[PDB]
Design an enzyme around this catalytic site. Structure first.
Site, PDB file in Angstrom:
ATOM      1  CG  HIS A 114       6.038  -1.894   1.691  1.00 53.70           C
ATOM      2  ND1 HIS A 114       5.317  -0.837   2.195  1.00 53.70           N
ATOM      3  CD2 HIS A 114       5.745  -2.957   2.477  1.00 53.70           C
ATOM      4  CE1 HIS A 114       4.605  -1.242   3.229  1.00 53.70           C
ATOM      5  NE2 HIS A 114       4.845  -2.524   3.417  1.00 53.70           N
TER       6      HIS A 114
ATOM      7  CG  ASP B 186       9.940   9.876  -0.795  1.00 53.01           C
ATOM      8  OD1 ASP B 186       8.854  10.172  -0.256  1.00 53.01           O
ATOM      9  OD2 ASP B 186      10.602  10.701  -1.478  1.00 53.01           O
TER      10      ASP B 186
ATOM     11  CB  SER C 105       1.612  -1.860   4.916  1.00 50.12           C
ATOM     12  OG  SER C 105       2.291  -1.319   6.044  1.00 50.12           O
ATOM     13  N   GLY C 106      -0.672  -0.779   2.997  1.00 50.99           N
ATOM     14  CA  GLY C 106      -1.496  -0.685   1.794  1.00 50.99           C
ATOM     15  C   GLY C 106      -2.926  -0.238   2.050  1.00 50.99           C
TER      16      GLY C 106
HETATM   17  C1  GBS Z   1       2.768  -2.126   7.160  1.00 51.14           C
HETATM   18  O1  GBS Z   1       2.847  -3.338   7.071  1.00 51.14           O
HETATM   19  C2  GBS Z   1       3.158  -1.454   8.434  1.00 51.14           C
HETATM   20  C3  GBS Z   1       2.510  -0.282   8.789  1.00 51.14           C
HETATM   21  C4  GBS Z   1       2.811   0.396   9.952  1.00 51.14           C
HETATM   22  C5  GBS Z   1       3.803  -0.085  10.821  1.00 51.14           C
HETATM   23  N1  GBS Z   1       4.194   0.498  11.995  1.00 51.14           N
HETATM   24  C6  GBS Z   1       3.774   1.597  12.636  1.00 51.14           C
HETATM   25  N2  GBS Z   1       2.863   2.342  12.213  1.00 51.14           N
HETATM   26  N3  GBS Z   1       4.349   1.887  13.720  1.00 51.14           N
HETATM   27  C7  GBS Z   1       4.462  -1.267  10.457  1.00 51.14           C
HETATM   28  C8  GBS Z   1       4.154  -1.953   9.275  1.00 51.14           C
END
Ligand code: GBS
Length: 234
Positions: A41, A90, A187-188
């Site tokens: 993503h 997924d 994220s990543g």
């Molecule tokens: C990635 O950008 C990302 C990862 C994790 C979350 N939220 C939670 N772990 N609650 C949002 C966005």
């Protein structure tokens, strides 16, 4: 990272910051001299021109890019997992090629992949890291943030995420009480678990319901399910 602390220099030498348009949008994990593992993503909609992405390796603080331990690399290939489903979230994993290889230092090292059936059991503390937001809808971290989060069973995670399809391709981590979690901008990046004094890339930071809420864990792409696919690039 919500409820974490400042990581020391060289704490997580596999952690890589991904920049697009001079903005750090996602984390990544170094797995060889020229390949990163990140989230699909992060790169979805932005994979056709891979040189728009820059990986900063050996990064500690975003406000100190020009220090001897940091190495910049343009990305020249992005391969999203062929089973990535955007809507369902997924198989949220991707490979990213460094245009030139990196030499390993105390600040730049690859993380080992799990064995194909390797078990990171529920209740064990693993670690997360990144430069993402420090509270839900708050500001990004300057210094790399770290935290420890306990793993959940997929059954418990599904119960806590009934609006989502929690698959075998996901692994969840979070506290019953919330407070400590990944968030937007992380994220990543890695979920890393230690066994026999060796760190393993158990997960790739993927999604959750907001961040740091009680009984709303982080969901991570389960890397053991993609080890064979990842290894075909190396
Ligand atoms: C990635 O950008 C990302 C990862 C994790 C979350 N939220 C939670 N772990 N609650 C949002 C966005």
């Amino acid at each position: 990272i919500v409820g974490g602390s400042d990581a020391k220099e060289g704490a997580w030498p596999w952690v890589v910051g991904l920049y697009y348009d001079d903005r750090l949008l996602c984390g990544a994990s170094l797995v060889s001299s020229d390949w990163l593992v990140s989230a699909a993503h992060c790169v979805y909609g932005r994979n056709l021109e891979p040189s728009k992405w820059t990986a900063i390796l050996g990064l500690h603080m975003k406000s100190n890019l020009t220090s001897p331990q940091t190495v910049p690399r343009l990305i020249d290939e992005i391969v999203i997992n062929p089973h990535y489903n955007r809507r369902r979230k997924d198989n949220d994993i991707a490979m990213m090629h460094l245009e030139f290889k990196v030499n390993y230092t105390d600040y730049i090292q690859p993380i080992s992949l799990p064995e194909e059936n390797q078990v990171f059991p529920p209740g064990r503390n693993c670690s997360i890291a990144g430069w993402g937001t420090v509270v839900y809808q708050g500001t990004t971290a300057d210094i790399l943030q770290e935290a420890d989060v306990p793993l959940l069973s997929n059954e418990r995670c599904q119960q806590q995420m009934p609006e989502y399809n929690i698959t075998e391709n996901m692994i969840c981590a979070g506290y019953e009480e919330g407070g400590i979690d990944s968030c937007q901008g992380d994220s990543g990046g890695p979920l890393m678990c230690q066994e026999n004094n060796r760190w393993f890339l158990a997960g790739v930071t993927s999604f959750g319901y907001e961040c740091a809420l009680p009984n709303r864990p982080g969901v991570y792409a389960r890397v053991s399910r993609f080890t064979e696919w990842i290894q075909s690039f190396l």
